[PDB]
Amino acid sequence: VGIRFCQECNNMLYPKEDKENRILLYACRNCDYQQEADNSCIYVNKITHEVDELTQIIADVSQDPTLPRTEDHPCQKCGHKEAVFFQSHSARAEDAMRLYYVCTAPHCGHRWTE
Amino acid sequence: PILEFLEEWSMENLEEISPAAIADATKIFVNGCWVGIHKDPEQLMNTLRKLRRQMDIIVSEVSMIRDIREREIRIYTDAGRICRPLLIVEKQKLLLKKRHIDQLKEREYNNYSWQDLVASGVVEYIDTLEEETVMLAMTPDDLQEKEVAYCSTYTHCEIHPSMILGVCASIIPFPDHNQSPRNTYQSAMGKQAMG
Amino acid sequence: LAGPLTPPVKHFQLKRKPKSATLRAELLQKSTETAQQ
Amino acid sequence: GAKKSAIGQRIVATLPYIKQEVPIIIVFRALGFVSDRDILEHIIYDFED
Amino acid sequence: NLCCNENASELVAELSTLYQCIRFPVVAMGVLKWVDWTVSEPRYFQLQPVHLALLDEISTCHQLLHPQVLQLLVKLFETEHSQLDVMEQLELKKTLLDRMVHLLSRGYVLPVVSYIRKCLEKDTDISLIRYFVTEVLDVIAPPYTSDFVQLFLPILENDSIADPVTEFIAHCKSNFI
Amino acid sequence: QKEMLPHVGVSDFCETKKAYFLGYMVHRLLLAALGRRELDDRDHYGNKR
Amino acid sequence: TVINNWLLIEGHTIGIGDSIADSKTYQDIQNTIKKAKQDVIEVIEKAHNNELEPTPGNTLRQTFENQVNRILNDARDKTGSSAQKSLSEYNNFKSMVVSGAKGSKINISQVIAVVGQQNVEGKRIPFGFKHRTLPHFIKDDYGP
Amino acid sequence: KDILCRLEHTTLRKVTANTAIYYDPNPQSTVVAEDQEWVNVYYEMPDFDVARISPWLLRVELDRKHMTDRKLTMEQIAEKINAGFGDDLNCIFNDDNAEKLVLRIRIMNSDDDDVFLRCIESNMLTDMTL
Ligand SMILES: [Zn+2]
Ligand SMILES: [Zn+2]
């Protein structure tokens, strides 16, 4: 779900309803500025949390000497043979030991799981 | 002096930035104080390690850690940190060549001491926080020789593994052939011997 | 020695074959993959 | 309570020489930051997360 | 060479060769005795298996070796395992039942179903028997034989848990009294 | 001015420095709460002096 | 008194030769350790490729840890058995263990064949370093 | 295992994958298209929504495999929610044949209506025993 700030005081725009017209309006409080909402979903939260570590992996980890290198998995965006592989190893995890690979060649940063 | 040097290079001070730049740049801490940010951490770390190895503006005991995945460079200069010297490995080769050994053999009437090894940028002090970012060879003769590749990115090499032991544990002959509580007990008793 | 052999006494029709043949196909693919190595 | 866990877990600060905690955004307000966007820009560096 | 190699992890590679060699009956039962001694040893099960797929081939090609394979499987079906978790032993015996079902598909129905009825009435959990009859009802099709229902039906009343079951009941009740 | 985060500074103009550092503290707490960073170990000897 | 005075004639000792095994025994032990390490590598690479499936009631990490633990325990017991079979009747280590006077079979296997797995809090050595047990290993190394 | 599932404390969080609160001003339509298919089926016989229901929709997604492991069904979860919250809430569930196991919830058309749904989510995900 998105986040909306006031265009007059830059504070949180909270959801609000006008029963007169039956539409969601994101209204600022202590400033009484209003905006026409469009998402129609004020709040969402995931429990199973099917989150992708590839979004959170950073290409610069190709420069880490402690990480292991492999030649068996060439890159896909440049074909570079050497890649650096590792595990997520965070919370929201410890259910998979799957490997995420980063293209070791500079100026590519192509990441992928297999 | 570290802060002056970092200001000279392209480090953006915290006051002189919009927050929008903080997303993609590496934060720079000095003794735990966030000083500013930098948009090219690798070159900065190479430069700082070069200076420390040359005994330039950075003294030897200063420790520099790059948390790559969290985009942080933490520089520590305060006292109380514990470190140990490690031989520097570059491109799977030691920087300690035979000429250093020759100069050290005639340590007397030459004044080529340990401090000249440190000044040569061959051996450097590493602390535990920086050990976290170190790929270390247990010994040059085997770990960095060619092989079915285990690791080909060693950064340092142990001088001798036996230097992990203390004073009273270093008088034990063949301590790696004992149950370790017996080594602990001998460490206790050697203080109580007669001599 | 014993002449021809009686085929097995059929007791039903295999509308589908058991998955042992599917396992055969997959392990045979693996044995090609290793032959490629 | 039924409404404390409704709004979700919140953050407090236990500053020195203060026998009680304080909410975080109060501390940011005390430092001269009135807009919530400025406070979050000091906390969250990427508003796409 | 393969059964004396024992270094083998290359067994996945030699499978097509092993199947073509297994087409010789004598080679097949040589593999059968080797698999017997291999699997029958303690602490064999630390793998996600392959030696039992060999038995699938063995019973696929040679009907004469049908009594042999069964006699091995029942032994493995009745051996007790300590280092294996209870659910793991359950899934292991499910895999052994899969091997029995594949053997049953080759026209060896009467002795395997007789053994199933035995260990039912004489022990093993009802879940394994229920899973077995589910697998049997999966692939069989009509018509059937009187003896096959004489052995398969009297084991099909001690449980009321699950349509091929009601379809089989509707067939055999009318046709096979 | 003096008690809260003195190592950042005690001048009357490090309010922005203190604000950024406190925001970084909150950011670290949130990264711990989202599980994107591991909790620091009290016995890890790099945390000792 | 009687047996202490007979022992002046018999005598009892313990030396290096009571800790040496036959060369065949050392080769067998080394082959066992080679095999066990290679199976641990097979379990690791099957886990890395997601080809490992968790056992019922266990997450994939617990499944993997139990697998490597049972592999290494199997290796330790096999090595200890081979080491104990190499012992001669004159081996003073065995002479002490058999009487129950001191030690036990596991001590013989540790002295002769393999010290085995070290455990703290009943699990393998933890990643005290950042995803490492020590700085001489690559990150995310679950080898023995 | 059937006895086992009847003893281990199962709460609504254990079976849900994600929850979402929508506005959805017109109850006879949905802001979600896939919802609309079976929602129009459920609004040919409106029950406690024959008049203007609250313009607040609490759609939750239920994990299929956790649903099957505990041998539950959609019907019993709807019944449990109705028992736990009386007639204050109208709960309308998709049929147990679509992959998206969905259970819309609204406040009854005889009673802040917004934050109370978040409180209801926090209450159900923790305190409710399926
Ligand atoms: Zn406003
Ligand atoms: Zn690439």
TrEMBL record, chain F:
Domain of life: Eukaryota
Localization in the cell: Nucleus
Function statement: RNA-dependent RNA polymerase that catalyzes the extension of a non-coding RNA (ncRNA) at the 3'-end using the four ribonucleoside triphosphates as substrates. An internal ncRNA sequence near the 3'-end serves as a template in a single-round Pol II-mediated RNA polymerization reaction. May decrease the stability of ncRNAs that repress Pol II-mediated gene transcription. DNA-dependent RNA polymerase catalyzes the transcription of DNA into RNA using the four ribonucleoside triphosphates as substrates.
Family statement: Belongs to the RNA polymerase beta chain family.
Record protein name field: DNA-directed RNA polymerase subunit beta
Portion of the parent chain present: 421 to 469 of 1251
Automatic annotation (TrEMBL), chain G:
Superkingdom of source: Eukaryota
Residues spanning the signal sequence: none
Cellular compartments annotated: Chromosome; Cytoplasm; Nucleus
Function noted in UniProt: DNA-dependent RNA polymerase catalyzes the transcription of DNA into RNA using the four ribonucleoside triphosphates as substrates. RNA-dependent RNA polymerase that catalyzes the extension of a non-coding RNA (ncRNA) at the 3'-end using the four ribonucleoside triphosphates as substrates. An internal ncRNA sequence near the 3'-end serves as a template in a single-round Pol II-mediated RNA polymerization reaction. May decrease the stability of ncRNAs that repress Pol II-mediated gene transcription.
Family assignment from sequence similarity: Belongs to the RNA polymerase beta' chain family.
Entry protein name: DNA-directed RNA polymerase subunit
Designated gene of the protein: POLR2A
